[PDB]
């Protein structure tokens, strides 16, 4: 019930990148080789960037870094017998290392065991975390190992000794490992430093990528200057160090660089651009605080949130920046020009008061709920503006956080304890002072580096909305496999997976991005235009027959508008002359897809065509994404010379009187909006919109309208003429025929295959009704010879009673139709030409009157039971048409009289597995029982349902998909680790919900998750036993044949 929302800090101010690949320690004879001056610059420039002086007595594990040295690019008997002893030999003016060091062929490796013979656990820490520090990882196991090519760990003589000490048998092992002792020199600790900091464009988008994926909700950005960025080379190693200030400052071709990367490859992803001017506190005043806060990409969305401080900020450890009041006025009029909300970053109590007195209500006026900082545990200074002197302003004082520190190195449950205790009674009164000041507003927690082990307990007891962790505020994670229990953190998303499995254990929920967003009022604009449409229809009923196409659209008006500028933006930007092979529809599609139009792929889409029947239905992609940009710039006056360049392709020109008018266009991308893909098909967004009370109901009117204005542009077309009522069709071993008026076809064959929204009956249509077929049965067929088989496939009626024509959108309005009917009571007349064929004679005795139509014109109760169990297959629409085959029958059930009791009995003799159900399946309803596989990225299934299962979430499944990205081939992929979810309905139907499938396509990503091959293809061996098990059985019931298959 207790919710958290948790924010990642990737990038922060204070801490540095510190290379792995670089070498950590410099031997004093190689510095020594230098002359005076460059031997004073490269000392001083190391030192201050990091780099401690130090004895000998330390150990080294190095290989791979040796360089020769020229001495005419600068002996000395001091130095000579330096370089000799650390394994150099001389050959006129130019050294070379012929000491050897044991090479990485296999990887270095201190194991768990080695290092629990330390009796001082503060000991190992320090080991593991330094070790940690320069790049080597922990494994599995519980042991540090090292991965690259190349090695240059060092650790320093208090190491060696306290190691020696402790026990000298794990030093003598580094020993026997290649480690070996130094000289005097200097070593890199690393202090406040990482190889996991992102401090570039790309590191820093990956980083937020990584966080968010673990289940963050708000990224906190910050950027680092490059401006006095050099190497040192120092002789003797083939690697130069790196140095820098790498200060924290705002740079905008960073962010040029970043948020429209971010925003679109995570597009509910809630972004927060640091305004700190820390590291630069001359700059307290500069507009260059709010430059970063703008408009950014084709969508030109802006960064969602910016930090705010109401007073100066003045940390005790050095450093800090000044907030004037003029230009705080000046940030937040900034501020709410673009559409920013400012996040409070409570540093100080001044901050505190500054907030709930003169900041008051222009803070409220920025906009509600206001958010809330809590800078915990970080020591800050007040000073008198008169003499000078500085007081204690932190939140937490700082004798009580030394206190604090103390009781967690303690590590015992009741220091914790006390320490939460002392926490929460000394923020307890900032909190409150907040919320009574803000009755609408938001509070979130940060705790800087060992305080982290508080964040949990602290929040909870303090009752806050959101706790933020990253590499801002701390470097480490907590690792209980490994030995101390604490180890560098491997990204921020190490320490956001950290928190998430905390809260999980506590049973606290996370609160995802989108969600966020609606709490805090920050929803994006193709989602509130979508909820706008929703709100616009909310009158109307589901009803076909009840509202008219002309009403809807007429309902839409303000929103068509909305629509058209989007398009005229995205008409103005393909004008903007490119590319002359067919890969100009890439140009096309990647500029549809960042303005948020998806160019969807239609399989009817060849009814605009006029040489249909001489077109290859294949390459249907690449014309498409062509006539595309002519259908929007044709309308307005643009060129669509550089396009018709399908002429140089194998006409593929769509004519004028086939283009599609603007409402049309506009009712596409209405229905498009519900489970988006991001830029690189990686994810899916906009989920939420499912959950909506309306949400079918509008699809349903959506797609009425959208099918009234389809079939108005087909009847002018030389598109296919379709035929009235279903084709039924056998497959033997593979075999075809087509029966006419035969039931006795239904009593030999094994399955029925139910028809898909494209199988509708018309030389296309039939032809992908084979298909579907034939892969059905070559799917069944395999799973035969493994520990006469004859399919039947239905195609739907291509036409109805008054001549309309069937297309997708009548499927698809049938089918969102269904899921808002909360009583079983709906279905279609392409559903009652299948069912009076196929299930009506199962409910009553011997052969009855068939009119021209193939349409119709008792109970038997012992023989209930005597009927054979009909097993069907179902994709895409087909769990829509078969629940509506219930349906009728419940209601001939009903006025045949099957006291619903035997009714249920009727409904155990048929059986269901459903691939891709892209229709909700009423478990209240009486009904067959149905095993559903509906995959994650079957976006077009995912909109056409509502079910909750279907969505992953951060967790073991999530974990999976991850995986199978980078690591796993399309081809060998196969959904194992599927978790079925089983249900029980009040009439007696059983659901067998597959959790956490998804399909990858051919690039192993997320696009084309409603193949129906790719449904079958990586259809996991446990799943096919399932499926066996149906086929290999005798006069059995459906619901002791899956109440078996739960065990
Ligand atoms: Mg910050």
Not at 652 to 673: A, N
Not at 942 to 970: F, K, M, N, W
Not at 975 to 987: E, K
Request: charged letters at 25%; aromatic letters at 8%; hydrophobic letters at 40%.
């Amino acid at each position: 019930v207790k919710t958290f929302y948790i924010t990642a800090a990737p990038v922060g101010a204070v801490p540095k990148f510190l290379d792995p690949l670089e070498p950590k320690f410099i031997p004093h004879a190689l510095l020594e080789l230098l002359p005076a001056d460059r031997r004073e610059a490269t000392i001083k420039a190391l030192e201050a960037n990091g780099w401690e002086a130090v004895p000998a007595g330390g150990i080294v594990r190095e290989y791979g870094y040796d360089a020769p040295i020229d001495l005419t690019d600068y002996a000395s008997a001091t130095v000579h017998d330096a370089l000799r002893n650390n394994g150099w030999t001389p050959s006129g003016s130019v050294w070379h290392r012929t000491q050897t060091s044991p090479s990485l062929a296999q990887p270095p490796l201190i194991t768990r065991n080695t290092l629990e013979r330390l009796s001082s656990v503060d000991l190992v820490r320090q080991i593991v975390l330094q070790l940690t520090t320069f790049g080597w990882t922990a494994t599995e196991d519980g042991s540090l190992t090292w991965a690259h090519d190349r090695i240059h760990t060092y650790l320093s003589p208090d190491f060696v000794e306290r190691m020696r000490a402790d026990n000298a048998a794990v030093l003598d092992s580094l020993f026997e490992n290649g480690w070996r002792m130094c000289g005097a020199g200097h070593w890199q600790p690393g202090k406040a430093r990482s190889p996991y900091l992102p401090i570039t464009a790309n590191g820093i988008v990956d980083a937020s990528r990584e966080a968010l994926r673990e289940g963050a909700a708000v990224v906190h950005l910050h950027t680092r200057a490059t401006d006095d960025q050099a190497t040192l080379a120092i002789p003797g190693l083939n690697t130069p160090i790196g140095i820098g200030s790498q200060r924290n400052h705002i740079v905008l071709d960073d962010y040029d660089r970043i948020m429209p990367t971010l925003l679109d490859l995570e597009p509910s992803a809630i972004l927060n651009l640091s305004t700190s001017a820390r590291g630069d506190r001359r700059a307290s005043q500069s507009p260059l605080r709010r430059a970063h806060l703008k408009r950014y990409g084709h969508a030109q969305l802006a960064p969602d949130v910016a930090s705010f401080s109401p007073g100066p900020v003045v940390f005790q450890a050095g450093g800090g920046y000044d907030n004037p009041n003029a230009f705080l006025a000046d940030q937040l009029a900034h501020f709410a020009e673009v559409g920013v909300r400012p996040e409070i970053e409570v540093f100080n109590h001044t901050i505190v008061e500054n907030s709930v007195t003169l900041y008051q209500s222009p803070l409220v006026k920025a906009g509600v709920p206001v958010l809330f900082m809590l800078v915990a545990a970080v020591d800050q200074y007040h000073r008198d503006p008169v003499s000078g002197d500085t007081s204690d302003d932190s939140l937490i004082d700082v004798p009580t956080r030394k206190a604090i520190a103390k009781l967690l190195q303690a590590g015992t449950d009741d220091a914790h304890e006390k320490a939460v205790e002392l926490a929460a009674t000394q923020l307890r009164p900032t909190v409150e002072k907040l919320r009574d000041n803000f009755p609408s507003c938001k509070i979130s927690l940060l705790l800087p580096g060992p305080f982290q082990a508080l964040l949990v307990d602290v929040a909870i007891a303090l009752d806050l909305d959101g706790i933020r962790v990253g590499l801002e505020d701390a470097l480490n994670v907590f690792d209980a496999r490994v030995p101390g229990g604490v180890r560098k953190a491997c990204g921020t998303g190490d320490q956001v997976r950290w928190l998430r499995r905390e809260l999980e254990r506590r049973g606290i929920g996370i609160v995802d991005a989108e969600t966020l967003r609606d709490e805090l009022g920050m929803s994006r604009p193709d989602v509130a235009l979508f909820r706008q449409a929703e709100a616009a229809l909310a009158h109307y009923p589901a009803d076909e027959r009840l509202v008219s196409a002309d009403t809807i659209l007429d309902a839409l008006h303000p929103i068509v508008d909305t629509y058209r500028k989007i398009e005229d933006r995205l008409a103005a930007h393909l004008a903007s002359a490119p590319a002359d092979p067919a890969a100009l529809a890439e140009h096309v599609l990647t500029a549809a897809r960042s303005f948020g139009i998806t160019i969807r792929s239609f399989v009817e889409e060849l009814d605009r065509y006029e040489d249909h029947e001489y077109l290859v239905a294949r390459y249907i992609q690449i014309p498409q994404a062509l006539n595309f940009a002519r259908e929007l710039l044709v309308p307005r006056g643009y060129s669509i010379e550089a396009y018709d360049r399908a002429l140089e392709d194998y006409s593929y020109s769509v004519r004028v009187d086939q283009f599609k008018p603007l409402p049309l266009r506009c009712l596409e991308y209405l229905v498009g909006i519900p489970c988006r893909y991001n830029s690189d098909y990686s994810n899916v967004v906009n989920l939420g919109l499912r959950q909506s009370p309306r949400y079918s109901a509008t699809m349903a009117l959506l797609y009425h309208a959208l099918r009234e204005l389809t079939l108005e542009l087909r009847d002018r077309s030389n598109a296919s003429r379709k035929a009235c009522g279903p084709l039924w069709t056998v497959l033997e071993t593979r075999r075809d025929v087509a029966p006419d008026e035969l039931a006795a076809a239904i009593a030999s064959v094994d399955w029925v295959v139910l028809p898909s929204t494209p199988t509708t009956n018309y030389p296309l249509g039939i032809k992908l009704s084979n298909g579907m077929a034939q892969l059905f049965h070559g799917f069944v067929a395999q799973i035969a010879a493994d520990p006469p088989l004859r399919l039947l496939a239905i195609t739907h009626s291509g036409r109805r009673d008054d001549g309309e024509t069937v297309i997708e959108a009548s499927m698809l309005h049938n089918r969102f139709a269904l899921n808002a009917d909360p009583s079983g009571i709906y279905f279609s007349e392409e559903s009652q030409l299948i069912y009076e064929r196929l299930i009506l004679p199962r409910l009553v005795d011997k052969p009855a009157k068939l009119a021209y139509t193939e349409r119709q014109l008792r109970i038997n109760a012992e023989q209930i039971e005597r009927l054979p169990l009909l097993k069907c297959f179902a994709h895409s629409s087909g769990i829509a048409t078969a629940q509506q085959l219930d349906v009728q029958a419940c209601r001939d059930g009903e006025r045949l009289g099957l006291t619903g009791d035997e009714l249920r009995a009727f409904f155990d003799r048929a059986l269901l597995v459903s691939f891709g159900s892209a229709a909700d399946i009423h478990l209240d309803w009486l009904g067959t029982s149905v095993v559903d596989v509906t995959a994650f990225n079957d976006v077009r299934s995912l909109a056409g349902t509502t079910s909750r299962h279907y969505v992953i979430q951060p967790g073991e499944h999530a974990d999976v998909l991850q995986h199978c990205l980078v690591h796993t081939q399309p081809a060998d992929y196969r959904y194992d680790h599927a978790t079925p979810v089983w249900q029980d309905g009040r009439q007696g139907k059983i659901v067998a919900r597959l959790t956490g499938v998804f399909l990858l396509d051919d690039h192993a990503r997320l696009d084309d998750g409603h193949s129906i091959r790719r449904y079958l293809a990586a259809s996991p061996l446990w799943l096919r036993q399932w499926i066996a098990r149906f086929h290999d059985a005798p006069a059995d019931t459906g619901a002791h044949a899956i109440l078996r298959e739960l065990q």
